[PDB]
Design a protein around this nucleic acid. Structure first.
Lengths: 56, 101, 156, 79
RNA sequence: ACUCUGGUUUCUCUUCAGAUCGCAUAAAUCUUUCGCACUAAAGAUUUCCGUGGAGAGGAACAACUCUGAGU
């Protein structure tokens, strides 16, 4: 997230592109983060984020 | 449906990290038509749901309130409404005028 | 306990008995939570924030809290949604980042060098027509909209 | 602990004292009520949770009264 | 229309708060529950996420616009 913000502030991508990147780094991020194996309980939060992404 | 309704009446009388919630766990499969196809919340022809596209939401209106508005409004009221609609269309065109490639 | 300029903290970070550093390292998750909470909103381009730079420099925590007026935040979110819908329906050739940053093993970019120099691009600020947005023209966009208006807000 | 207890010093003592004071200050929010409730719960559990040692504690206290002749005349269980 | 204790902002500490302490929402342990528990419910406990109440102390600039009061 911090590096995406830096790239948004380094002129690599547009601000709308930064918002899309944040949306990707939050929703559908269980695959990217891979925190489910570390703590199985987080899968509920991952499913909630997926549902929020679907609604949005 | 009908057989499903009768079966429901009789019934009332008597590891793996799944990422996406499967559609099996969904609800709102109602046999009755009245509780399946219910009239939407048409806010007196002047409102709609949030988030959805305003142009799309207004386009897909039921037109029931619009008919009453066009068959009840006064002639001067009709002229004022036409002027307001013309102003809104001009604003949309100005928005459409700023779009180019 | 007077404050100090951030330049000293940046120099210490770029420059820095392992007792003091190891002892105070026990609060990194709090710093991570503070950094997540104090991330800039889409309406803001650069969001300066106050932090707590440890003497050892092991962890710096953002002392500020993200308190925002509810109607102002709702208006910002609605304007952001409208602008996003417009940009999506217009810029159909949208190339989302949709990838991890290039630093697979690269050293972290120095915020002084590659982040404190380039002027950022314009954020997602919906156009404000003074015909209907006059009462909230200046109050619509800010890190803290009413951080100084005594008449409107409580204060700092 | 991943950090060996060996490499300490007076500065280490000061840093540890400061960190422990900060932790104790940040842990005193509900510390009094939590401690009182936990003590009451332990007292309640003492009614239904006798230690194996506690079990034979009353017998072991009186068992010391056996004299040396009594503690030496104990026959082998084979007879 | 006379006068009068009465300024707000902000920092810190203590203490209390079952009030939707917060128009938000997590974690952990035990317990009961059918398993053979991310994909599950119940009861409790605890720590965070951060508040309101009051008191105490501190530094900035308002001194009576204001209001309550002494006409």
């Amino acid at each position: 997230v911090v590096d995406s913000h830096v790239q948004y502030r380094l002129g690599n991508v547009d601000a709308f592109q930064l918002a899309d990147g944040l949306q990707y780094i939050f929703a559908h991020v269980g695959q990217l983060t891979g925190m489910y194996r570390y703590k199985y309980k987080l899968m509920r939060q991952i499913r909630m984020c997926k549902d929020l992404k679907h609604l949005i | 449906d009908k057989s499903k309704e009768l079966h429901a009446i009789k019934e009332r009388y008597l590891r793996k990290f799944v990422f996406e919630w499967d559609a099996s766990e969904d609800t709102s499969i109602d046999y009755n038509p009245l509780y399946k196809e219910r009239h939407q919340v048409q806010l007196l022809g002047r409102g709609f749901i949030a988030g959805i596209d305003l142009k799309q939401q207004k386009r897909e209106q039921s037109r029931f309130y619009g008919d009453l508005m066009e068959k009840r409004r006064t002639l001067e009221e009709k002229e004022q409404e036409e002027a307001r609609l013309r102003k809104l269309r001009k604003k949309e065109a100005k928005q459409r005028w700023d779009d180019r490639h | 306990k007077e404050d100090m300029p951030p330049e000293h903290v940046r120099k210490i970070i770029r420059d820095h008995d392992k007792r003091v550093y190891l002892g105070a390292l026990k609060y990194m998750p709090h710093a991570v939570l503070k950094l997540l909470e104090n991330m800039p909103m889409p309406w803001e381009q650069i969001r300066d924030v106050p932090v707590l730079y440890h003497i050892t420099g092991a962890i710096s925590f953002v002392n500020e809290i993200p308190w925002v007026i509810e109607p102002v935040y709702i208006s910002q979110w609605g304007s952001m949604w409208i602008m996003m819908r417009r940009e999506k329906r217009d810029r159909r050739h949208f190339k989302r980042m949709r990838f991890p940053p290039f630093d697979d093993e690269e050293p972290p970019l120095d915020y002084a060098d590659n982040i404190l120099d380039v002027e950022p691009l314009e954020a997602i600020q919906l156009e404000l027509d003074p015909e209907e947005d006059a009462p909230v023209l200046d109050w619509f966009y800010d890190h803290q909209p009413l951080r100084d208006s005594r008449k409107y807000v409580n204060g700092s | 602990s991943l950090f060996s207890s060996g490499p300490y010093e007076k500065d280490d003592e000061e840093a540890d004292a400061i960190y422990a004071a900060l932790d104790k200050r940040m842990d005193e929010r509900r510390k009094e009520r939590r401690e009182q409730r936990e003590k009451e719960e332990i007292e309640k559990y003492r009614m239904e949770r006798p230690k194996i040692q506690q079990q034979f504690s009353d017998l072991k206290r009186k068992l010391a009264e056996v004299t040396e002749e009594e503690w030496l005349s104990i026959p082998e269980v084979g007879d």
